[PDB]
Design a binder for this molecule. Structure first.
Ligand SMILES: [Zn+2]
Ligand SMILES: [Zn+2]
Length: 102
């Protein structure tokens, strides 16, 4: 899909902390789509969502590469690069059934 930047060389297959955006789950609120780090395994709603968990989390932890978990297409977005590359065979397995609200 896209040439992976050096950041990709340090990402692995991780395990999600929840069945969706943990922050949204804390208040029982829906999400649009989910982005999980290929590092800490923590999930978050995209910046397309008004909650913006993935973006604030990125700034908080420094995890620039996220994967679409809610849409398990198998791609990795690197915030600092703005490039979306392929993770088709490395895609994170489901730890449960993700509640698609939207
Ligand atoms: Zn990068
Ligand atoms: Zn993270």
């Amino acid at each position: 899909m896209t040439m992976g930047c050096r950041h990709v060389a340090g990402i692995r297959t991780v395990t999600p902390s929840a069945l969706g955006c943990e922050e949204c789950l804390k208040i029982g609120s829906p999400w649009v789509h989910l982005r999980i780090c290929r590092t800490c395994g923590h999930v978050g709603c995209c910046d397309d969502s008004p909650h913006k968990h993935a973006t604030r989390h990125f700034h908080a932890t420094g995890h620039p590469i996220i994967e679409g978990y809610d849409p398990p297409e198998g791609w990795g977005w690197c915030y600092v690069d703005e490039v979306m590359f392929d993770l088709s065979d490395r895609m994170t397995p489901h730890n449960g059934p993700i509640p698609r609200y939207v």
